[PDB]
Structure 1
Amino acid sequence: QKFNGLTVLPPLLTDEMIAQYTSALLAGTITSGWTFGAGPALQIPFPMQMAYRFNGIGVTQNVLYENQKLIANQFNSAIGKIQDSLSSTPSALGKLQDVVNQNAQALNTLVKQLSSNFGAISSVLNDILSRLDPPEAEVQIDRLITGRLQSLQTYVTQQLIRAAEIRASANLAATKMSECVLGQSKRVDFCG
């Protein structure tokens, strides 16, 4: 949709381009453990990497080797269950749907504020100008200007506050990427 004064700017990173970043992060993780987050990516066989991640939680690595078939089956089953889980449980993506809903609602309110009189004889500037002489049309227009400017300012303020919330979430997500994806976190319930 396109309206009077409202424009939406395209993000700098396209969705086709963020998928490449996540592909790089995956490939790096599977093929090199956490080593690629510190220095050069150093290949390591994946069961050996999982053995060292087991060793990183106080389980000897012989456990993983003596039940690798079992652990791989459990991992495959758990990954498969994610698809069904978030496909069948609604409101699972609610935290993402809510940002879209809130932004759309704020814009709809901002546009619907152009239908308000604020005490003017009419809300249509051309209609009031076409039938009132200038020294009174000035007074009528001024109320409309004041109301519309106040509406725009309220919109800007709520956008600033919501953007602060989204920035806090994005900082949390960056910390989680660094500390869960590029490392193994010894830190309780931070990564699940």
Structure 2
Amino acid sequence: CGDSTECSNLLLQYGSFCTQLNRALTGIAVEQDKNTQEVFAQVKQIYKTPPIKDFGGFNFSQILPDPSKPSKRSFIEDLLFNKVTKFNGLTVLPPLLTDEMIAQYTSALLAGTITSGWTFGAGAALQIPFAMQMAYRFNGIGVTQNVLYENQKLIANQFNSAIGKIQDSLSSTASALGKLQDVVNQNAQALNTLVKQLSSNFGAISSVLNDILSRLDKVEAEVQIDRLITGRLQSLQTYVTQQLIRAAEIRASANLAATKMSECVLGQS
């Protein structure tokens, strides 16, 4: 309608479509916070790594949080953030969890899984040196722990070189994060075409309510307004249905992600 008494009166007797639309949108909006909470919020407490860093020769400085930065985001996170790239009744609501607490959950996970191991996923976190957690993790793929302790330095160097190569590949190669960019583009174009639909006659003499109201009388404008209302309602319904389908897909993906992080981070799948 956009601030029209006549339009509100005409829309009133169209049942309760608007209530259903708002309810569906609110449900799918709550579902996002539900997804984020059920993914990240796996740990009862928040852990912090000790300042003294000596993990048997490995090096995690590029993935641990950097206290210098105000956001406490690790280097790889900053590279990722740099890699990835009006008002007509539609609004965008902020997420419940901001970036800083998300970073803190990631840091807590990443610092528990370094010193405690997998035990912090079941009961209370139990300290254990990293060079022995690797022996335990070899012992789980049919390779005896005999191998590791003669190859500590070679394995450490290979790990450092690999992580550096990952850093360089992420920094240089573009479009390495196509999936997230695709999701964002899909949402943006859906909103954009929904906005653009407002300039369609739909059979009416014009695409602006105020002008046809101001140029006509309140007997004949009825039909034109009705055509506009039904067309716009159809478009909005279509957009809502598409949103529902995409939300179901994203929920499936988030369930997969939660399973992956529960199985591979908190233990050896």
Shorter-chain TM-score range: over 0.9
Deviations 1:142-170 (A, max 9, x none): 00001111111111000000001110110
Q: Shift in Å at residue 60 of structure 1? A: 1.1
Distance in 2 of aligned mates of 1:124 and 1:70: 72
Secondary structure class of the residue paired with 1:134: coil
Q: Shift in Å at residue 92 of structure 1? A: 1.3
- Which residues of 2 match residues 57-96 of structure 1 at below 5 A? 57-96=141-180
Secondary structure class of the residue paired with 2:264: helix
Deviations 1:89-139 (A, max 9, x none): 222111111111111111101110101110000001111111111111010
Distance in 1 of aligned mates of 2:186 and 2:200: 22
Distance in 2 of aligned mates of 1:3 and 1:154: 20
Distance in 2 of aligned mates of 1:38 and 1:67: 31
Q: Runs of 4 or more off by more than 3 Å in structure 1? A: none
The runs of 5 or more residues in structure 1 that have no matched partner are 186-192
Among candidates 191, 209, 221, match of residue 125 of structure 1: 209
Q: Shift in Å at residue 86 of structure 1? A: 2.1
Two-structure CA RMSD over aligned residues (Å): 0.9
Q: Percent identity?
A: 97
The runs of 5 or more residues in structure 2 that have no matched partner are 1-85
Distance in 2 of aligned mates of 1:58 and 1:80: 28
TM-score by length of 2: 0.67
Distance in 2 of aligned mates of 1:88 and 1:51: 35
Residue 40, structure 1, aligned to residue 127, structure 2: no
Distance in 2 of aligned mates of 1:78 and 1:37: 27
Distance in 1 of aligned mates of 2:108 and 2:164: 22
Secondary structure class of the residue paired with 1:122: coil
Deviations 1:28-75 (A, max 9, x none): 100111111111111111010001101111111121000000001111
Distance in 2 of aligned mates of 1:147 and 1:96: 32
> Quick one: higher RCO (CA 8 Å, sep 6+), 1 or 2?
2
Q: Shift in Å at residue 87 of structure 1? A: 2.2
Distance in 1 of aligned mates of 2:167 and 2:201: 51
Distance in 2 of aligned mates of 1:78 and 1:36: 27
Distance in 2 of aligned mates of 1:54 and 1:33: 14
TM-score by length of 1: 0.93
| More helix per residue | 1
Distance in 1 of aligned mates of 2:176 and 2:89: 35
Q: Shift in Å at residue 184 of structure 1? A: 0.5
- Which residues of 2 match residues 1-192 of structure 1 at below 5 A? 2-185=86-269
Deviations 1:2-53 (A, max 9, x none): 4111101111111111111110110010011111111111111101000110
Q: Shift in Å at residue 83 of structure 1? A: 1.2
Q: When the two structures are aligned, how many residues end up with a matched partner?
A: 184
